Amino acid sequence: KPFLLPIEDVFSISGRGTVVTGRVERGIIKVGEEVEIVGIKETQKSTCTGVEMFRKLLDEGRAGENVGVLLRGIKREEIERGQVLAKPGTIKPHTKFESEVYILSKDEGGRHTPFFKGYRPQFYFRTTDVTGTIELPEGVEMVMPGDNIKMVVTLIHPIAMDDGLRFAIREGGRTVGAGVVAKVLG
């Protein structure tokens, strides 16, 4: 299974690069391997010049505890939380997808009122929130708290994703829905 680390935090060290941390999602990362940084920004490539798995391993990282990865030549402003590190060519950034979503009821801590076609919530993928717009299916004018709904989402910033990727729907910091990426589009 190809290596994937969602980025949580970033720590910059002068003249050697930047250390990014997160929990490895799948695969293995070893020192010296090339990786891509995917999502939000244009994709970039870089090499691990150091890896550490908290309490367990030096120069390799696996699923489980946190992993720090030192990327040579990557400066602080070129990387951000919400991106992923990935084996090159195994995941791509997208903005538009078909989703299956459940909208929380009010009693579940969600919305009080239904939403309409101009709803601009945040979509939370792995470690970060991204604003997106929606396209309701034909004849559906409103979605009631407590409904399931199939919708087309367009994010304002790309996110590394594949079909099956789960996400949360958020408003003001609170979870108002949960979804899965059904079909990536563009």
Partner 1 sequence: MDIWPEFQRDLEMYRDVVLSIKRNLRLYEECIESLVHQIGSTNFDNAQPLFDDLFRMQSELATMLYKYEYKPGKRIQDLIYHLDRDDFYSRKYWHKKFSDGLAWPEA
Partner 2 sequence: GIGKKISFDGDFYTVDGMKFSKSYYEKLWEQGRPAPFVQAREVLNSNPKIEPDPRGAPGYLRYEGAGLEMIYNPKTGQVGHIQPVKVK
By beta-carbon proximity to partner 2, the closer residue of 61 and 121 is 61
Q: What are phi and psi of 32, to 5 degrees?
A: 100, -20
131 makes contact with partner 1 (CB under 8 A)? yes
Among 23, 26, 41, 170, binds partner 1 (CB under 8 A): 41
Which residues contact residue 42 at a Cβ distance below 8 angstroms, ignoring those fewer than 6 apart?
A: none
| Nearest CA-CA partner of 87 in 39, 49, 26, 35 | 35
Considering the complex, what minimum distance in angstroms separates the CB of residue 45 from partner 2? 19
CA dihedral 153, 154, 159, 165 (to 10 degrees): 10
Among 4, 5, 18, 21, binds partner 2 (CB under 8 A): 21
Note whether 170 and 157 are within 8 A (CB).
no
Among 7, 37, 38, 51, binds partner 2 (CB under 8 A): 51
Q: What tokens appear for 132 in the block?
A: 């997106």
Among 16, 45, 75, 166, binds partner 2 (CB under 8 A): 16
Residues that bind partner 2 in the complex, under the rule CB under 8 A: 9, 11, 13-16, 19, 21, 30-32, 50-60, 66, 68-70
